[PDB]
Structure 1
Amino acid sequence: QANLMRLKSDLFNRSPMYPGPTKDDPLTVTLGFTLQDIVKVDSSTNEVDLVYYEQQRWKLNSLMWDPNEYGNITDFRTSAADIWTPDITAYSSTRPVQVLSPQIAVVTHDGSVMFIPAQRLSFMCDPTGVDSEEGVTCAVKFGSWVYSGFEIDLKTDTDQVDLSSYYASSKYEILSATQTRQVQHYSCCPEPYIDVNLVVKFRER
């Protein structure tokens, strides 16, 4: 307890909070999805609801420490309000995301942060044909809402979505699920934005 209280005090009480990334000190966030369930499709509004968790990983110099000065602590859990977190947003959602897990992240001595929020998302998707053998494909882009590619870049560790926790008695079975980095240009804005495109192909079980 004593060593950890001291470490947290030194990282969070002694400085102002990290103000986020800049063009001079950009940040790369690693994203990965673990898909748990396609809960419902609404064919009258073209909305689909997913439950998943989203692994987020980044690294800051201001969160480094030497374990020997703090009783060999290599990592700790902390409330996500104590730290900056990236503003990763689904681009075609139709409702506010519902949070299904505690807002707690893990910080490691090299300055890396891992944050794995579980979410339920409603997004735009036409499920016509879901009851056929071929199924339907739907897609949703995840990226920073406010930072361009000059401040936040994204990457994945793999292009395969993790399906090993997928609910075996779901109404829908997954035929494939990929997660892929893309670059986008928008009408509002001259600079490239980065996203990860989650593409899921599914049908009725």
Structure 2
Amino acid sequence: SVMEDTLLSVLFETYNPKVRPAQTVGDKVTVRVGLTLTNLLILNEKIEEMTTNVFLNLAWTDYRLQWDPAAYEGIKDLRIPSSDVWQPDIVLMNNNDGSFEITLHVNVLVQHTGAVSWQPSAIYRSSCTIKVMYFPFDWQNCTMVFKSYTYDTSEVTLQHALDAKGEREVKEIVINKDAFTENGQWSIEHKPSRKNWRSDDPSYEDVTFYLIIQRKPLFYIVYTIIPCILISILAILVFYLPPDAGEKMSLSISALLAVTVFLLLLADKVPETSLSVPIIIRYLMFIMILVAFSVILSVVVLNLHHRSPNTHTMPNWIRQIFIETLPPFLWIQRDLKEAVEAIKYIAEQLESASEFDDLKKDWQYVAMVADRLFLYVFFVICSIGTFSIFLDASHNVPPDNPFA
């Protein structure tokens, strides 16, 4: 028979995996914990839930799992099923769903010195509060806390994992260059690891892995930012159409309808968090308010254009403001006597028609000057608002120090 069987029989004759391997009563088991991220699957904002694939490198020491390789066939290391040896219940405390424990339950590796190393892989779904203020140009400080669910600091002591050689502590999330698919929407700016045991409860101790992830907003830029910019361009264009065309409303209210459609599109993907309003939602609301004000001002322009002297009278202040002052500043400037008296009546009617047309043209001139003023004001305010919003969005750089 292979001596591995006899070695297992010798080791597990009185072994019990229900008890921590404290050789002396009141001792502690030093457990080193490290993480290896294989593939950051997703970060769902509608649930505030991060789903990832991890390897949980654990290292501890059992005094019972000792043997001399000289007495056997040079067996320096051994592979044991994970259900036979003692195991600390190191779980993810902040898991969103009920999956506290690992998934695969790989075999453990035991050296002859008693050191036990374990690398089980698991799909973990944690929960991180999402800063929804700068969505989608934001960065997320997600957190994965690992600690023994049952054992406290008087029974185990959590440390950091070591490198490929036993010289230094990693103090960060190990990433394998092989077998790592980069997520198409997130960039790992910082991946530190720390211990943040609290002060009010001395029994608490845990190892926390932080993921500073920056989102690449190209999808939302293509599908939401550019159409909103185009609708803003159309809203500015509304004030350049002549009032007699009859398409000012048919353009402005249709731009509003397009904004409504874009908001319907955005309602599926934006986070449900009510703590703050996303900057994309603020930009959409700003565009919608601008389009509504464009509708209001185009209504005012059409009303001024369709006025007539038999329905409205020109006040002094309108004549002073919209004729004399603003157009210079806006570069806008400019028995047969029965038949005889019948011809005289025709001439009188022509005179009255010309006076009526002159007053109507004055009203139309006022409408045109007000339309140009509204065009310039709208262009300035839209450019300033969009520039300020995008300048605030572009300055949301994640901090240099990850607080490790």
TM-score normalised per structure 2? 0.46
Name the structure with the higher strand share: 1
Aligned to 1:138: 142
Cα deviation 1:84-103 (Å, max 9, x = unaligned): 11100111101215755452
Aligned to 1:195: 206
**Alpha-carbon spacing, 1:81–1:109, altered in 2? closer, same or farther (3 Å):** same
Q: Residues 95 and 126 of structure 2 are in contact (CA less than 8 Å); yes or no, is this contact kept in structure 1? A: yes
Aligned to 1:181: 195
Aligned to 1:4: 4
Q: For residues 148-167 of structure 1, what are the structure 2 equivalents within 5 Å? A: 148-156=152-160, 157-165=169-177, 166-167=180-181
**Alpha-carbon spacing, 1:170–1:15, altered in 2? closer, same or farther (3 Å):** farther
Cα deviation 1:23-70 (Å, max 9, x = unaligned): 613101001111122211221121111111110000111101111111
Aligned to 1:114: 117
Q: For residues 14-33 of structure 1, what are the structure 2 equivalents within 5 Å? A: 14-18=13-17, 19-21=19-21, 24-33=26-35
1:63 correspondence with 2:65: yes
Q: Residues 80 and 104 of structure 1 are in contact (CA less than 8 Å); yes or no, is this contact kept in structure 2? A: yes
Please identify runs of 4+ aligned residues in structure 1 that moved more than 4 A.
97-100
CA distance in 2, matches of 1:108, 1:3: 16
TM-score normalised per structure 1? 0.88
Q: How many residues align?
A: 200
Aligned to 1:41: 43
| CA radius of gyration, larger in | 2
Q: Residues 104 and 115 of structure 1 are in contact (CA less than 8 Å); yes or no, is this contact kept in structure 2? A: yes
CA distance in 2, matches of 1:81, 1:93: 23
1:168, CA displacement in angstroms?
Answer: 2.7
Give structure 1 stretches of 5+ with no counterpart: none
Cα deviation 1:100-158 (Å, max 9, x = unaligned): 545211010000111111111111113434632x5111112111111111101010022
Name the structure with the higher helix share: 2
Q: Relative contact order (C-alpha < 8 Å, sep 6+): which is higher?
A: 1
**Alpha-carbon spacing, 1:3–1:170, altered in 2? closer, same or farther (3 Å):** farther
CA distance in 1, matches of 2:14, 2:125: 39
**Alpha-carbon spacing, 1:99–1:24, altered in 2? closer, same or farther (3 Å):** closer
Give structure 2 stretches of 5+ with no counterpart: 161-168, 217-404
CA distance in 1, matches of 2:102, 2:151: 23
Please, which of 147, 152, 169 is the counterpart of residue 151 of structure 2? 147
